[PDB]
Amino acid sequence: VGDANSPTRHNGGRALARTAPNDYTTELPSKVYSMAFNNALSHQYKSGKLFVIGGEKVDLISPTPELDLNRLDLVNTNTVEGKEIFEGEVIFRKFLEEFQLKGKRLLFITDKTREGLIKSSDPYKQKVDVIQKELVEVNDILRAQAVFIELEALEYLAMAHQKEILHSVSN
Amino acid sequence: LMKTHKGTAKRWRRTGNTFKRGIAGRKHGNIGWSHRSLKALTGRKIAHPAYSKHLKRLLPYH
């Protein structure tokens, strides 16, 4: 026997032990990451679970309803001088049951912070995630069983994850 | 990170997909021998496959 720290002992140390912070970072080319992102978006679109919510920058051939908005947000939430509940969560639940998606994973990609939507979807945090266009990931998109994305956010992501072309003049 | 083995660096150089070297045995005791024979001890040779692996490990960045 030697010292009391030998791994072969009951109170001994552990052989070949790790020391936190363990490094598990991995790297992957940006072109491949962009291709994967396009593939995830295409998968959602092909599955018919990608919804696009936008306006005010493109020509509309059908006018927007008075009650609705052209942005991925729910206005009239901070007005809580009513009853114990207010309009935001009520409208969100009505949307939820109207479209028949209650315990289903939902993703909301936005351009800027939508505090009304965040507050209104807080009760369903277990299944609904809200992210800005900057911070979205392939795992979020692929996990979501229904993905909503604003038109400007989709424009931005498409531009960012775009194949690059120069000149390329040919017969 | 590994470091180039400077002795091998000074005695060997990279050429093509292999290494070159000088000859051994022509720095003294040359008188009395044939010049047309010692001609074979002047110049360079190439690395040998028996030690190519050793050289690759000794000169990682070459």
């Binding site: 003049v169 | 150089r13 051994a24 050793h54």
Partner: protein, 212 residues
Amino acid sequence: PSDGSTKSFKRLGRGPSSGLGKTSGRGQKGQKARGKVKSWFEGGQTPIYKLFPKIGFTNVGAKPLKELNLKRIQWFHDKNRLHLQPGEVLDMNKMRKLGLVTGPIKYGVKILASGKFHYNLPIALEASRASAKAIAAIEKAGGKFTARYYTPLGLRAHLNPQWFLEKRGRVPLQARPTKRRDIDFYSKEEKRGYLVMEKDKLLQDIKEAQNK
């Protein structure tokens, strides 16, 4: 994952039928079984890094040049990737900008003549130097070549002048040659040296120094 992009790492010391059991590939006994020995240690005999003599020296004054052949220039032309406005010179700045010479340019560029038989561009060219065959081909095609002298800082200013304009508001003046080798090379005419080909003041100053 895609097929052929993942394997199973060989697991050691975890059973007889695994094929890598008690010895786990080490073999039977020895220093290598339960110890560490250099891969290039050969038991005492004079090593390959001792038997042979130390040959040569490292030239710290070296100026490696990126090589550019004429076939690449002609190829860019025929691909319509050589965008030169009429009466414009193809120098190292334009080589970098167009993509003729890619990567970092430490010291300069030398034009070699590999596609000389098919080179027919009458454009003008600038570089640190060029081969004799390259000079002949460039002139035969109706072009023009001159070899210019750049230091590291001067070549940085030449390649990326807007960097200097943004950071300091001015591009540094190109430095006059100071060595003997540079002055001699760029005073040679068969090399198309810029000093001689443009009859600039430096050679005149040197001449006024000698004649005194």
